[PDB]
């Protein structure tokens, strides 16, 4: 039973991986570029200023 539960955890983990990659593919289609570009441009500006 404990190894069956370990296999259950492993299959839950791989199903989570499939969900993550599916959501990544979904993000590859939706317009999610300009806002994040501005966000990490500000992040890199703050990184340069912090030093």
């Amino acid at each position: 039973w404990v190894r069956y539960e370990a296999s259950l955890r492993q299959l839950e983990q791989r199903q989570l991986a499939k969900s993550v990659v599916s959501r990544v593919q979904s993000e590859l289609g939706n317009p999610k570029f300009q806002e994040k570009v501005l966000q990490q441009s500000i992040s890199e500006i703050e990184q340069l200023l912090s030093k």
């Binding site: 955890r9 492993q10 839950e12 983990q13 989570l16 992040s43 890199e44 703050e46 990184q47 030093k51």
Partner: protein
């Protein structure tokens, strides 16, 4: 689940902090890849033997630092990395997790968890390349290692801290004797006295994943996985993984050794490690030294096996017993890699293929298998009985060869020949059968003291079982006295003599 979410959030916060801190502190552009070695530009002030992060995700390490270009050996498949990939450096020397959490866990050369049992909890990180302890930190090998083979491995012992070699051809029993030693260490690591526990660590370098899976299955079948680390690099991963896995196993071994604990490390089949270094050096622009082998193979064996040592009481009295294994071709112990490893070790254990095919499962040749702990670093009960039995057996072999040369006062008329043949037939063992030290003295004592003249070679196999049953059924007094004392005194010698000539009639 709940843990992956918070783990991912914390680690990506740390990732953003790293990206926003000191830029990345150095980078590089890939110039070439292949066979697990990658050239890269940049990295002007990169440290030597330093881990590097690749954009694809493959790990790396710096064996060579040329002007401009940097020689990086690829830790994993080279398929992912391409030209122009950014190569971030980790900022630290190549390390591996070390600690008590690695017990019961299988990890790769880099120390990442590969068994899928969860994260590795390590007290700290130790460099894969660590200078061996000096003369004073080292201590004379005096604490025995219970091999549990009921063979020459007992009469000429291993002891805590020796790098006793296991030479022989493939499928001769090198892995077999290694696993028997690991299983026999359970009787001593299952207690509470940490001064006698031997936390084993396996190095399954150049071993197919099916074989190492069967090996770990056999380990946990005998409840041996609780104290054994299976840090290794199988044949699936790249050559640098094979090259580094034994060194990181050595790092784990020193962590056990530097903490006052005793650890047994078995470098299983270092030959693939040597040829993996060959593969690195061929395309890393290091010319080969001798016999198509780069010269530094002897040096790498030196640094890797000399780390195995018995620490002094000042350093914690820790031990790092090593069991190197080499796969020779056709029994050629005079080949290059043999010559270096026989000169790198503290004695060897020969396993010829002919003896394995003859029927002797241990298949160990007494004549050439030497060690530096003759009648030392033993229990004491076995060391008094057979402190010089190896020389007697070698002389028996020579005279038996001499006996067949010409018909003279030899053969069965020679007491030395009879005793030698009976002892050689005595020294046998079946796999997955760890025998304790207490049930080994009476057999060797009967052999050495000339009590087996009238027992016949064919009946010695039954005599062993009968004598062991005799002790374990109706003579457990002296057996338990030997086990608890770890030595046979005048009283124990007299009791063993009583038992042996009482049972000689049967």
């Amino acid at each position: 689940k709940a843990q992956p979410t918070e783990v991912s959030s914390i680690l990506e916060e740390r990732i953003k902090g790293v990206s926003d801190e000191a830029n990345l502190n150095e980078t590089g552009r890939v110039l070439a890849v292949g066979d697990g070695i990658a050239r890269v530009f940049g990295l002007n002030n990169i440290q030597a033997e330093e881990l590097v992060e690749f954009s694809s995700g493959v790990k790396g390490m710096a064996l060579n630092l040329e002007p401009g270009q940097v020689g990086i050996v690829l830790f994993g498949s080279d398929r992912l990395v391409k030209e122009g990939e950014l190569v971030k450096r980790t900022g630290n020397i190549v390390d591996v997790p070390v600690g008590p959490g690695l017990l019961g866990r299988v990890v790769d050369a880099l120390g990442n968890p590969i068994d899928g049992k969860g994260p590795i909890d390590a007290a700290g990180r130790s460099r894969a390349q660590v200078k061996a302890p000096g003369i004073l930190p080292r201590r004379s090998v005096h604490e025995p290692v219970q091999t549990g083979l009921k063979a020459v491995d007992a009469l000429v012992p291993i002891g805590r801290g020796q790098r006793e070699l296991i030479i022989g051809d493939r499928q001769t029993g090198k892995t077999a004797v290694a696993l028997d030693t690991i299983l026999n260490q359970k009787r001593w690591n299952n207690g509470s006295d940490e001064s006698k526990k031997l936390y084993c660590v396996y190095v399954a370098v150049g071993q197919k994943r099916s074989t190492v899976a069967q090996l770990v299955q056999t380990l946990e079948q005998h409840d041996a996985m609780k104290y054994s680390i299976i840090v290794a690099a199988t044949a699936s991963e790249a050559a640098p993984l094979q090259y580094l896995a034994p060194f990181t196993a050595a790092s784990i071994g020193e962590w056990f050794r530097d903490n006052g604990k005793h650890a047994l490390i078995v470098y299983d089949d270092l030959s693939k490690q040597a040829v993996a270094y060959r593969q690195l050096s061929l395309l890393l622009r290091r010319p080969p030294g001798r016999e198509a082998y780069p010269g530094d193979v002897f040096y790498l064996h030196s640094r890797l096996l000399e780390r195995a040592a018995k620490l002094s009481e000042k350093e914690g009295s820790g031990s790092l017993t090593a069991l190197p294994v080499i796969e020779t071709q056709g029994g050629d112990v005079s080949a290059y890699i043999p010559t270096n490893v026989i000169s790198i070790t503290d004695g060897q254990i020969f396993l010829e293929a002919e003896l394995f095919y003859k029927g002797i499962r241990p298949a160990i040749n007494v004549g050439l298998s030497v060690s530096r702990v003759g009648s030392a670093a033993q229990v004491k009960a076995l060391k008094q009985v057979a402190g010089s039995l190896k020389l007697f057996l070698a002389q028996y072999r020579e005279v038996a060869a001499f006996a067949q040369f010409g018909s003279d006062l030899d053969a069965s008329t020679k007491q030395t020949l009879v005793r030698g043949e009976r002892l050689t037939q005595l020294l046998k063992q079946n796999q997955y059968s760890p025998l304790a030290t207490e049930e080994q003295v009476p057999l060797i004592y009967a052999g050495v003291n000339g009590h087996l003249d009238g027992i016949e070679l064919s009946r010695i196999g039954e005599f062993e079982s009968s004598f062991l049953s005799y002790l374990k059924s109706n003579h457990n007094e002296l057996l338990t006295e030997i086990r608890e004392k770890g030595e046979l005194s005048k009283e124990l010698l007299a009791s063993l003599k009583s038992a042996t000539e009482s049972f000689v009639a049967t």
